[PDB]
Write a protein that binds this ligand. Sequence first.
Ligand SMILES: Nc1ncnc2c1ncn2[C@@H]1O[C@H](CSCC[C@H](N)C(=O)O)[C@@H](O)[C@H]1O
Ligand SMILES: Nc1ncnc2c1ncn2[C@@H]1O[C@H](CSCC[C@H](N)C(=O)O)[C@@H](O)[C@H]1O
Lengths: 448, 455
Amino acid sequence: MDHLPIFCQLRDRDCLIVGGGDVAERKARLLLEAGARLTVNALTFIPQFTVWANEGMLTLVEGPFDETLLDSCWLAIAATDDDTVNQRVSDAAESRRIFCNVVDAPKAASFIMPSIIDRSPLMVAVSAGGTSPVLARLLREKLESLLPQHLGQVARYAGQLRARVKKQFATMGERRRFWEKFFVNDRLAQSLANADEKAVNATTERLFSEPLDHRGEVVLVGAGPGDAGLLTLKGLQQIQQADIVVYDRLVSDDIMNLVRRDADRVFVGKRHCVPQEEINQILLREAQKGKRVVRLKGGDPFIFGRGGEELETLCHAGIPFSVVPGITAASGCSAYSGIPLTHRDYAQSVRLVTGELDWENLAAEKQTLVFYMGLNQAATIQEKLIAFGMQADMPVALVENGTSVKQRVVHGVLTQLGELAQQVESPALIIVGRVVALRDKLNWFSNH
Amino acid sequence: MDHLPIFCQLRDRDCLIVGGGDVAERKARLLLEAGARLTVNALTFIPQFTVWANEGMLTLVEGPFDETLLDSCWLAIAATDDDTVNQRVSDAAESRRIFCNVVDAPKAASFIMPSIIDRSPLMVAVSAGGTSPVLARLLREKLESLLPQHLGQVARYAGQLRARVKKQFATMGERRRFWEKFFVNDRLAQSLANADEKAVNATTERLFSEPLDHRGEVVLVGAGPGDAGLLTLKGLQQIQQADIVVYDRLVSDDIMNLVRRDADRVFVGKRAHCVPQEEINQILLREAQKGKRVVRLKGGDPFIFGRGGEELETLCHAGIPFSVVPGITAASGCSAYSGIPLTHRDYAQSVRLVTGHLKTGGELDWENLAAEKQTLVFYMGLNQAATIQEKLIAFGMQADMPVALVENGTSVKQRVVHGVLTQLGELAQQVESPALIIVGRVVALRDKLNWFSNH
Ligand SMILES: Nc1ncnc2c1ncn2[C@@H]1O[C@H](CSCC[C@H](N)C(=O)O)[C@@H](O)[C@H]1O
Ligand SMILES: Nc1ncnc2c1ncn2[C@@H]1O[C@H](CSCC[C@H](N)C(=O)O)[C@@H](O)[C@H]1O
């Protein structure tokens, strides 16, 4: 990120604003509303400032810019119509290692004022670094309507129960459950809104008198083939609130960037890859500790992932679990590669596969084949397929990193299969079938 | 307002972190993605720190808190489990007017670290002042799914167009509506993240070329088996930006509640009269020509027994841009929500998705399907359940073969029924559409993997 957002406590803290026009006035209005000890240096002031000045809410210094005026500040803001004077303020501020903003110059200085969506104590800030001011405004707009006008009341109240909540529940599991039940409560939200104390207390007491569960859980979550956009809503939700996430190398970084920031992350791969057993053990141990475990697996956990293996003992262990399906590689890759898995007469049967496996059955057709881990076996596949009677002219396709910005699709025919497979590395998916034909009549993702 | 939110430029700026544990490691990761010139002072560090240090990412200062270590500091964060030590780091940071955060004491020092949605350079932050950390993740979450992944791309890219935009658009409101269309054009955003220069120019041009009010395109989107939770982020992002939504009966009521208040809807499924496919294909092509952002909402997955290809092969010349957002297909959903994995250790070597009979044009392949190591998943076979029981054990499938049926999978009224092949047609007159027929030994796994409620 090119900016780190932080929420500063400016109470009884000095801040300086240079410039006394309308721009400066808007900024000053924000700092006062944050309770800063504000001083304003300007050549001329517009009414407002004086109003504040004789209302003792700030200090005014009429006259040219004075670098020493920064010596006791936490924040500096240059808002004059004079760019030369502005960078004198910025340079002064930097020598003093004070964060500073030059409003009409967003690439300069050391910080930018984001657009604010107030719902105290709850606040949302949005910005583009000065690159897309129309993007921020549109966003603030969408956000203004998206956040309930009284959402602050609930947050405020939450902080006040914060104390009784810890004393009523031993574990994190019950408190985490408390708030979840709490921020979903409309009667409460409504109650708070109508300053109806009776309804608030009634609902509050019941929440405390509730027998919340203390045990943890393990959740299998399909991460999809790679494109973070293919994660399900429920999936995003799981990694957004998990205490520990167990991911392998088939989970794209983009997807990893969606995980809760304050969560533990265990890599279960080719550091080997922690045999199955070692992965399983980790899970139940983490859930045992009453944690919210999330086993993030590529594609869909129940279609080739040892998803079941990872669960088939948790019930004997009394540990809660659930599964969140994801887009299988075959699903995404096919779609992203302009190849539908089924069409008008082509297939009435789709196959997901993998000295091995029934070639006569696979050879047959009015089917479309999708081999999951046959890259180092691609060669013998065409030999066997052709051997057991599959048309040499039959089109085939390979997809490496399907769904990713790095997607790569090689195309050809059975005879070229083995060759092609060398034109690609892992992870790659092999699709055999008449449906590959209509790839560039439907290809939309990339030209590579 | 109690906290003023500000966005800091930390690239190559001195920031100090006191602490070397996991809490310290998260703040460092963040500070690092922000480009801070990071120094971490702690008694002991966890592996992650040595890595970073052993790769010139940051500086380590193993030992007790060194106050001089703040002398040229811009930011400080107290991440130690010792409140007295933290209290000292906080006192030292304020003594020299330095914004300091004390991880476990939100209203203790100068600033609070917000929850962050990164779409750099577009960034959103959420905070309740340490009153409701939980409400913040709830909000982080909502915003994360609402903002498409590559938004930053079009944000960075806008500047290179700002010029052409004023040239061509003289009225403020015009330029504004342009940006509105530009910022929600996810195809372009993808072409940019795809480093697909041609498509970037193709798409950029179209934007100016086409009439301002036109946003013509077609998006095939998989709705999932029913649960609005099985919808993909992208799919939701699309459904919120639709001008018109063409949808069918297998798209959940709950998913529809997510479609833009007043974007026209067009029901094309079975009505209490069936709509011909070419008419549907034609509504798509035609309405995108009228310059409307069309989204064909499909039950489950677009290219899996959904006739999704056809609705697209018709768009290759109308010159209409199109894309496909895959969805969770019925098999995947019913599998996960029934406790019947489609593959397991031995049981596992060919998952087969096949169609029953309202979809004909030839005849079925019985001994192909009868094999011994595949998991058969039948779509639309409820009406041929007996015809499949008889013709299956007929071609060798062991009658004691476990089978199951999953109706309204993933839904709150999901029904799962199971047993042995010799009961298929019987357990079928026990379900209604839509359902799937799963034949395979993996069905027995449900004894240990059932977790969803049954109806
Ligand atoms: N993103 C991807 N791109 C191409 N192939 C993939 C892939 N993800 C998985 N595969 C194929 O499947 C193998 C891993 S097994 C996991 C499959 C995943 N559960 C799914 O449902 O798709 C890889 O070796 C590769 O051959
Ligand atoms: N939620 C659901 N639960 C159980 N079966 C379902 C289902 N949704 C669809 N099906 C099965 O799929 C058939 C329609 S064919 C369309 C399938 C869709 N494209 C997909 O990807 O799943 C239905 O008749 C039924 O057999």
